[PDB]
């Protein structure tokens with residue numbers, strides 16, 4: 001009962017295509033990960049199982065590394081965590097890279113696990129390594145991860161016979177880097193990384209016809225536009241606010257390919273993204289490196305301090321459509337929400353609305369969540385008609401990008417019903 005199938009593309013390798021016409025919002029695939037792990041920055045912040053930020057987490061007794069929101073989450077996570085727990089324990093104080101911890105879970109899943117439904121269309125052994133396209137610097141980085149893995153796993157795995165029969169650690173890491181999915185929360189922090197081999201069949205487009213959304217570790221693949229029978233299915237591997245030059249570099253470095261898509265050919269939106277004095281937004285772009293690092297580690301007061309020094313800077317300022325200014329406004333909004341400043345969060349969030357409409361496609365999950373947060377801030381500050389307009393716009397987007405299978409849609413429906421009741425009382 002699949003609406004999608006694997007096929008061999010001409011120049012792109014393997015891909016995924018529709019066997020039947022698809023309509024916007026239609027659910028193509030849903031899977032749990034083959035393996036996944038919390039990211040280094042969100043470790044000890046978000047529950048290891050459900051990846052939700054909780055006010056109270058508790059450490060696993062043995063390793064004291066994994067943290068859980070509930071006994072339910074540690075029990076559900078115990079099969080995945082059982083063997084790595086002894087590895088994390090023995091390697092303290094040192095914490096392995098995310099890719100190393102992710103591959104360790106892959107190895108344990110393949111060794112001790114039943115066949116994973118995540119592999120239905122495509123398996124881990126099928127994944128693209130792009131090894132013959134790797135530069136010598138990339139290969140050396142992989143060699144370092146191999147030795148890190150051999151150190152990190154030395155407790156559980158001392159020899160190749162404990163690895164799967166065909167398993168080559170160099171090839172395995174090459175596969176992990178190109179096939180890893182980043183799991184993000186509503187604040188654009190990356191809370192986790194996981195492998196979904198069936199979903200790895202989707203080739204990239206900067207103008208994709210599909211989108212992925214995450215509910216905890218659970219992934220949902222949906223069509224965001226009408227798709228003809230036989231048409232290849234694509235997602236965007238990258239953040240939507242990047243210049244064609246930035247996208248080219250990232251797609252080269254990580255995925256070893258050159259994007260020929262129409263947006264990259266025409267440098268679509270590049271000029272509008274870079275508006276303002278070039279010297280000014282180079283300095284903002286440099287500051288974003290530190291700001292987004294603080295955000296990855298969930299230090300909001302420090303994020304807001306740096307963001308205000310930009311938005312409010314005595315020195316020259318940039319238009320809100322400048323993508324680096326826009327990223328700063330977004331980080332400030334998310335800091336104000338966590339720090340409990342709603343008026344200021346709404347001020348920043350309101351300023352991101354029109355730029356988000358321009359830069360994000362018609363239905364994109366990032367924009368849907370952004371509009372939902374703004375409408376939610378407006379509702380709680382008691383602007384009902386403004387909140388209702390944005391909550392309805394968020395629903396128009398998120399019914400396509402998220403769908404009834406996503407828990408956030410249920411929350412949005414409750415916000416709409418509350419906002420509507422307030423308007424009718426007036």
Ligand SMILES: CN(C)CCCN(CC[C@H](N)C(=O)O)C[C@H]1O[C@@H](n2cnc3c(N)ncnc32)[C@H](O)[C@@H]1O
Nearest residue numbers: 012013014128178179180200201202203204255257
């Ligand atoms: C988490 N997710 C993002 C993983 C993607 C794994 N693959 C896709 C499936 C591949 N075709 C396969 O056979 O397994 C990427 C790889 O696919 C190629 N690829 C893609 N999109 C191109 C595109 N638009 N143009 C050219 N090559 C593309 C590229 O080599 C690139 O590393």
Ligand SMILES: [Mg+2]
Nearest residue numbers: 013130131132
């Ligand atoms: Mg190849």
Ligand SMILES: [Mg+2]
Nearest residue numbers: 187188330370
């Ligand atoms: Mg946001």
Ligand SMILES: [Zn+2]
Nearest residue numbers: 047050069073
């Ligand atoms: Zn949990």
Ligand SMILES: [Zn+2]
Nearest residue numbers: 060062063085
């Ligand atoms: Zn443990």
Ligand SMILES: [Zn+2]
Nearest residue numbers: 206259261264
């Ligand atoms: Zn492109």
